[PDB]
């Protein structure tokens, strides 16, 4: 009985920005879902494919953890449906999702006193994303019919925009840390099983 390292993802000191969400594999474990549900620190624990109270007897071939940091308001855009902006340009969920989303407030940690800069979010893309596609590339993006000569003067705006994350805003704007678990039962021997 060798438990699996979830503590290395939820207690991460920092969380990647939204447009470059971290994507970690997990395999060859006995995953303990008891802690992840009973905990009193989360503020949004949701599961779509399988209700939380029966995760102790479902063996998956593989499991992935996505991790990032989003605005407090926009946490209502991480869902199969419920499209919008962030789910439209940065991280889109597949429609037949079988997984869970865990979002909790981190007002104290991820917000500095004078104004942070390490967190950026995408804007001004050519077309809406497709499920799970990661686009970390930065290229100067055009607005209208204008030759893009590396010039950003009303011709091609730089996509990424910077979060402020001031420590004195209302509850609707302080950062929220999000971890999305995705389960996979591909044709292969069961690699992980709760006890």
């Amino acid at each position, epitope marked *: 009985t060798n438990l699996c390292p979830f503590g290395e993802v939820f*207690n991460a*000191t*920092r*969380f*990647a920005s939204v447009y470059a969400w971290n994507r970690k594999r997990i395999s060859n474990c006995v995953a303990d879902y008891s802690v992840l549900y009973n905990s009193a620190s989360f503020s949004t624990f949701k599961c779509y494919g399988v209700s939380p109270t029966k995760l102790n007897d479902l063996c998956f071939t593989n499991v992935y953890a996505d*991790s990032f940091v989003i605005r407090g308001d926009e946490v209502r855009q991480i869902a199969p449906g419920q499209t919008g902006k962030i789910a439209d340009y940065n991280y889109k969920l597949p429609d037949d999702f079988t997984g869970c989303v865990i979002a909790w407030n981190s007002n104290n940690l991820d917000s500095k006193v004078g104004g942070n800069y*390490n967190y950026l979010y995408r804007l001004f893309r050519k077309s809406n994303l497709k499920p799970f596609e990661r686009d970390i590339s930065t290229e100067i993006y055009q607005a209208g019919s204008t030759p893009c000569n590396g010039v950003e003067g009303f011709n091609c705006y730089f996509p990424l925009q910077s979060y402020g994350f001031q420590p004195t805003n209302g509850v609707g704007y302080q950062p929220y840390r999000v971890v999305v678990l995705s389960f996979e039962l591909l044709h292969a021997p069961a690699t992980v099983c709760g006890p």
Partner: antibody
Amino acid sequence: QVQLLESGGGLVQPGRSLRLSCAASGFTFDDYAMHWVRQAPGKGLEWVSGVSWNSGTIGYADSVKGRFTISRDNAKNSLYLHMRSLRAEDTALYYCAKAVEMVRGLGADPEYGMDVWGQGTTVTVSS
Amino acid sequence: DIVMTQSPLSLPVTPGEPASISCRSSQSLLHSNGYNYLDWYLQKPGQSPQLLIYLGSNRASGVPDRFSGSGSGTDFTLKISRVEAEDVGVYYCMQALQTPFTFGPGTKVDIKR
């Protein structure tokens, strides 16, 4: 064996940009918090910037804040430092160092211990 | 925004004579864990610097047992019991508590005559 190779040096006029790159080879690249430390010509060291295990920056030096921009890539085992709006006072060597404690190996996460150091470049600025 | 100091500023040492150096801070680095976060670093003449001591006194890996670290609060010291011909250069003390980190002005150790 552990190697830390940096590149990007060369004469650059004031008011331009540069992109230094440090590549690590010989350990779990994503299992150490990297740091970028300057070294003035014939003077003492000076901390410049850093990055933790999960690509989360840990702040820059007080006198440099506003221009430097650090970034990390675990897939290609690389650590980049973009520099903009230079002045004549930013000529120095630059080392990229590694932390000692592996994350989750024992309170908080570790950041100290700049143990292994590559041979720095020789960035300079003048007109 | 924490400023250190070191003493003595520059001292001449002679092989076979113990060495002592003091690093002082502004805010005591005692963390909630009870660990001081000061680190002691060495630089040889003409090479990249190297680590000497981390976590206050915890001896670093690969260095001989001729170095000692002590102190707490706002005062820490490094003592070289048996100095030799390969212990010349510059010494620095670095904080790890409140970012940004900082390096001391540096102590210059050389051979006396």
